[PDB]
């Protein structure tokens, strides 16, 4: 049925420094636009499973 408890990050502003760690979940940001916390056109969560 699928083990959906193992996630990974697939969007970030900039690549990590070595041995750096980032557990935030603040929404992403597509083309120029606000998007005050809410998916939609060009914008969406940063974690997949």
């Amino acid at each position: 049925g699928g083990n959906y408890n193992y996630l990974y990050r697939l969007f970030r502003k900039s690549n990590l420094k070595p041995f750096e760690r980032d557990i935030s979940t603040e929404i992403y940001q597509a083309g120029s636009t606000p998007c005050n916390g809410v998916e939609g056109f060009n914008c969406y969560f940063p974690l997949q499973s």
Binding site: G2, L10, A30, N42, Y44, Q48
Partner: protein
């Protein structure tokens, strides 16, 4: 802009591969063992 389309497809390429899997795995269980359930 074009870089917005690349980030659109990556979101697509991850959600589709799992939803196509289960939708084709359930078509296997019907094809090799027929019930109506």
């Amino acid at each position: 802009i074009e870089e917005q389309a690349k980030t659109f497809l990556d979101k697509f390429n991850h959600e589709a591969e799992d939803l196509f899997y289960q939708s084709s795995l359930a078509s296997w269980n019907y094809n090799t063992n027929i019930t109506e359930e």
